[PDB]
Amino acid sequence: TRKSIHIGPGRAFYTTGEI
């Protein structure tokens, strides 16, 4: 259950990982 969630500014959403 690996996932990369990085929230920087107030308009960014990066969700890329395993499942």
Side-chain angles (χ1 to χ4, degrees), residues 1-14:
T1 62
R2 332 167 181 160
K3 219 189 178 93
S4 310
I5 306 305
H6 202 140
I7 313 303
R11 49 210 64 162
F13 271 123
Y14 273 47

